[PDB]
């Protein structure tokens, strides 16, 4: 019914500091990377640990909308972050929770890889077309690079 899929790709910053600035601060750099598209993500409870409940609130398109996400465990240790979406606009009561994977890895060349699992589940007869799913991959991707790319400018209190 579901099938899962994986994405690798390359970027900046080693595993440890990527992942810390991906997790620890994705609440605070997720709506930084598009805050006109997101009012503001607030956690109900968990502060992004396991089990943790977010609200995400959209202020354009709609008059109304939010979408929730929930984490399923997370390892500071393994360099590992997992987490599911809940409800939102692009989900609609026909398709169900998504369960996202996040997985941060090093190469000797001094560069990090990061691979990201994805699954999206359906009430039963709605389905998605592959093709749909592979556009939303590549606006991904462009995200994760927009995370390097604001630890690689290093903002200073002085400016």
């Given at each position: 019914g579901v099938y899962t899929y994986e994405n690798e790709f390359t970027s900046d910053i080693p595993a440890p500091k990527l992942f810390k600035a991906f997790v620890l601060d994705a609440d605070n750099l997720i709506p930084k990377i598009a805050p006109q598209a997101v009012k503001c993500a607030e956690i109900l409870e968990g502060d992004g640990g396991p089990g943790t409940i977010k609200k995400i609130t959209f202020?354009?398109?709609?008059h109304y909308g939010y979408v929730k996400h929930k984490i399923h465990s997370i390892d500071k240790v393994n360099h590992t972050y997992s987490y599911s979406l809940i409800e939102g606009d692009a989900l609609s009561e026909n398709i169900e929770k998504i369960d996202y994977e996040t997985k941060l890895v090093s190469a000797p060349h001094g560069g990090t890889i990061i691979k990201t699992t994805s699954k999206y589940h359906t009430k039963g007869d709605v389905e998605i077309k592959e093709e749909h799913v592979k556009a939303g991959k590549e606006k991904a991707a462009h995200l994760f690079k927009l995370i390097e790319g604001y630890l690689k400018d290093h903002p200073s209190e002085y400016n």
């Open positions: 202020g354009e398109g709609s």
